[PDB]
Amino acid sequence: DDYLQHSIVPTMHYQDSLPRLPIPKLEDTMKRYLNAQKPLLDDSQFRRTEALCKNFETGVGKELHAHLLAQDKQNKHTSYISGPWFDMYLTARDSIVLNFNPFMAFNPDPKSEYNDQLTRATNLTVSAVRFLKTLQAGLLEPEVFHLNPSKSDTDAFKRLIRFVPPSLSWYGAYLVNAYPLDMSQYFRLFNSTRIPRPNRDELFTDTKARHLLVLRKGHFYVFDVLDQDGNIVNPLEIQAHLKYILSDSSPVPEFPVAYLTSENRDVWAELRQKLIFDGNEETLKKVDSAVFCLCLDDFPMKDLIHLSHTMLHGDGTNRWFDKSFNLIVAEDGTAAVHFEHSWGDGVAVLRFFNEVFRDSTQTPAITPQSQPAATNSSASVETLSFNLSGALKAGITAAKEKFDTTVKTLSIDSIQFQRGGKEFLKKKQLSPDAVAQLAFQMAFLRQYGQTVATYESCSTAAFKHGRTETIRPASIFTKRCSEAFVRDPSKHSVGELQHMMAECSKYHGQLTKEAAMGQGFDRHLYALRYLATARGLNLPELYLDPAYQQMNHNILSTSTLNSPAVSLGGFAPVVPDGFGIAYAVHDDWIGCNVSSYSGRNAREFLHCVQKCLEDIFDALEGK
Numbered sequence: 230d231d232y233l234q235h236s237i238v239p240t241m242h243y244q245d246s247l248p249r250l251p252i253p254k255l256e257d258t259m260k261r262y263l264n265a266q267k268p269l270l271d272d273s274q275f276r277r278t279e280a281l282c283k284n285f286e287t288g289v290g291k292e293l294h295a296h297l298l299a300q301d302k303q304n305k306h307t308s309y310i311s312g313p314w315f316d317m318y319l320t321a322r323d324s325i326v327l328n329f330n331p332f333m334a335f336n337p338d339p340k341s342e343y344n345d346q347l348t349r350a351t352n353l354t355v356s357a358v359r360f361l362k363t364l365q366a367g368l369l370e371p372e373v374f375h376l377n378p379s380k381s382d383t384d385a386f387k388r389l390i391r392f393v394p395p396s397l398s399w400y401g402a403y404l405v406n407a408y409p410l411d412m413s414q415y416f417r418l419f420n421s422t423r424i425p426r427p428n429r430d431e432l433f434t435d436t437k438a439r440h441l442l443v444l445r446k447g448h449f450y451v452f453d454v455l456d457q458d459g460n461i462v463n464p465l466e467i468q469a470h471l472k473y474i475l476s477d478s479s480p481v482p483e484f485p486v487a488y489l490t491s492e493n494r495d496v497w498a499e500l501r502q503k504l505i506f507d508g509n510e511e512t513l514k515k516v517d518s519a520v521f522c523l524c525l526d527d528f529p530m531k532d533l534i535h536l537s538h539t540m541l542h543g544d545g546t547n548r549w550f551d552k553s554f555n556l557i558v559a560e561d562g563t564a565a566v567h568f569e570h571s572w573g574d575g576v577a578v579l580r581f582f583n584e585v586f587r588d589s590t591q592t593p594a595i596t597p598q599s600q601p602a603a604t605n606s607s608a609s610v611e612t613l614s615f616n617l618s619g620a621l622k623a624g625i626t627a628a629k630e631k632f633d634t635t636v637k638t639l640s641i642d643s644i645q646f647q648r649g650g651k652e653f654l655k656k657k658q659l660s661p662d663a664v665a666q667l668a669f670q671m672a673f674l675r676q677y678g679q680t681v682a683t684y685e686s687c688s689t690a691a692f693k694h695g696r697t698e699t700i701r702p703a704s705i706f707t708k709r710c711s712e713a714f715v716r717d718p719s720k721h722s723v724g725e726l727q728h729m730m731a732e733c734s735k736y737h738g739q740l741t742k743e744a745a746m747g748q749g750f751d752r753h754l755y756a757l758r759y760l761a762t763a764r765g766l767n768l769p770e771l772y773l774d775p776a777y778q779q780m781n782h783n784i785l786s787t788s789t790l791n792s793p794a795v796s797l798g799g800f801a802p803v804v805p806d807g808f809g810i811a812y813a814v815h816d817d818w819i820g821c822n823v824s825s826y827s828g829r830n831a832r833e834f835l836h837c838v839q840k841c842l843e844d845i846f847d848a849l850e851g852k
C-alpha cells in the first residue's frame with residue numbers, strides 16, 4: 230500500500246475534547262514576572278518595576294484581564310493566545326531568514342550505498358508523500374504524551390478508546406495518565422505557503438495540487454507525485470524525473486527568483502504583486518500549491534559548520550523560504566528540513582521528521598540499483614518561466630545583495646561533550662535539562678561577566694490550539710550558583726556546591742512543569758499588550774518601562790529536541806548581540822550547536838560551556 234502507518238484510532242479523534250489553555254490569575258503572573266526580573270535588574274531598577282506591577286495589577290492590567298477573560302469565554306473553540314501569536318509572526322516585516330526559519334539535519338542512512346543523492350532524494354520524497362497520504366487517510370497515530378506508555382500505548386487501549394465519541398474521547402486518555410496533543414497545525418504541513426501582503430502577511434493552502442516543486446541551481450521545476458486517482462506515482466518515474474533534473478546543465482540564472490523570499494516583508498509584498506501585474510500569477514500559484522519543495526544542492530558537506538550554514542540559509546539561490554518547508558538533499562546525500570515558522574511550532578515537524586526518517590531507511594521505496602522507469606521527463610517535468618520587468622530585475626539584485634551582507638555576519642560552531650549525559654545526571658537525582666541551562670548561564674558569566682535575559686522554549690500543545698509558553702532559566706538560584714562556581718570557587722565546599730545545583734535543578738523543574746501547564750507569565754502579559762493596542766488604547770506604562778523590553782531582548786535563546794533521527798539542528802540568534810543555542814542531552818553525551826553575529830563570539834562561548842560542564846561533573850563526583 231501507500232500508507233506508512235495504520236492507526237485504528239483516527240488521527241484527529243481527540244481534537245474535539247482537548248482542554249482550553251488556561252489563563253493565569255493576574256497576581257501570579259506579576260509575581261512570576263518579578264521573580265524573573267530579580268536576577269537581572271539592580272536595586273533601584275527593581276524598585277521602579279515593582280511600582281508599575283502594582284499600578285498595572287489593580288489599574289489598567291486588572292481591566293485588560295477582565296476583558297481577556299470574557300472574550301475567552303466567548304471563544305471557547307480556540308486558545309486565547311493563538312491569534313495574537315500567529316500575528317507575532319505574520320506582522321513582523323523583518324526577513325524570515327535567520328530571524329524565524331530554523332533547520333534540523335537528518336542522520337545518514339546506516340547503509341552506505343543509500344546515501345547517494347538520486348536514491349536518497351527519491352526515497353525522502355516518497356516517504357513525505359506517503360506521510361501526507363496517511364495523514365489524510367486518518368491512519369497516522371494521534372500525538373500523545375504518555376506518562377505510562379506500557380499502559381496506554383497498547384493495542385488494548387486503542388482497540389477501546391476508538392469507540393468513544395470525539396466529544397468525550399480526551400477523558401479516556403486522561404484517566405490513564407495520557408495526554409493527547411493539538412494537531413491542527415498539520416493541515417498546513419503540505420501544499421501550503423506564506424504570502425507577503427502589507428501589514429498581516431497571509432497563509433495560503435491548496436488541497437487539490439498534486440505536484441512537487443524542485444529547485445536546482447536557481448531553476449524552478451514541477452512534476453507530479455500524485456496521479457488522477459490520488460495514488461503515489463511510480464517511484465521509478467519519480468526517480469527518473471529527478472535524475473533528469475540532476476542532468477540539466479544550464480547554469481545559475483542572472484536572476485534567481487528565490488532571493489525575493491529573503492527580503493523585508495513590504496519590499497517583497499510589493500515585488501510579488503508586480504510579478505502578478507507583469508503576468509505571473511499562474512506560475513506563482515504553481516509554486517504556492519506544491520506539496521512542499523525539494524532543494525537539490527550540487528555540492529558536498531565539508532563539515533558541521535558548512536552543513537549548518539547550508540541548512541540554515543544556504544547561498545540564497547536555492548530555497549523558497551515562504552514555503553511551509555523545504556526538503557534539502559545535497560551531493561553526499563546530507564539531507565535536512567528548513568521550515569517557515571508562522572504556521573507551526575515543530576512538534577508537528579519533529580513528528581513528520583521522525584516518520585520520514587524511519588520509513589525511508591527501513592522501507593526504502595527504491596534501491597541504489599533500481600533502473601529508472603522509461604518515460605518522457607521533458608513532457609512531465611515543467612520548467613517554470615517568469616516575466617521579469619526592469620523593476621523586478623532591480624529588486625532581485627537588491628535582494629541578492631542584502632542577503633549576502635547579513636550572511637557574512639553569522640558564525641556557527643558546535644560541541645560534543647563526551648564525559649557523559651542523561652544517565653549520569655539522572656543518577657545524581659538532577660534534571661538533565663537544567664544542568665545544561667546551568668552550563669549556559671555559568672559559561673556566559675565566565676566569559677562576559679553578566680547575567681542576561683534567557684529564553685527557553687516549552688510546549689503548550691496538550692491544550693486546544695496550544696503553541697508554546699516560555700521557560701525562564703535564569704533564576705536567583707542559577708545566579709548564586711554561578712557566582713559560587715566562578716568568582717570564589719574556593720570559598721564554598723564540595724557538598725555546598727552540590728546543594729545549590731539541587732536548588733537550581735529543583736526550581737527549574739517547577740518552571741518546566743508550570744510552563745507546560747499554561748502557568749508562565751510571558752504569553753499572558755503579551756496577550757494583554759495585544760488587546761490594548763487592538764482596542765486602540767495607548768500602550769500601558771508596564772511595557773514602556775525599559776526593564777520590560779530588556780526582559781524580551783533574549784541575549785541567550787535556547788531550544789532542544791531528542792530524536793535518533795536528528796544529527797544536529799540550528800537557528801539564528803534572535804537579537805543583534807545574541808546567541809542561538811540548539812542543544813541536545815543524550816544518554817552519554819551533550820551536544821550544542823551555537824550561532825552568533827559580529828558583536829559576540831561562538832567558538833569561545835563554547836570553550837566556556839565545556840569547562841562549565843567539566844566543573845559541574847567534578848562537583849557531582851565529589852572531587
Ligand SMILES: CCCCCCCCCCCCCCNC(=O)N[C@H](CC(=O)[O-])C[N+](C)(C)C
Pocket residue numbers: 331332333574575643644645684685686687697786787788789790795796797798799800803811812813819820821822
Ligand atoms: C552537534 C550537537 C547537536 C545539536 C542538536 C540540537 C537539536 C535540535 C534543536 C534545534 C530545534 C530548532 C527548531 C525548533 N524551533 C523552535 O524552538 N523555535 C522557537 C519557537 C518558540 O519558542 O515559540 C523559537 N526559538 C528558536 C527562538 C527559541
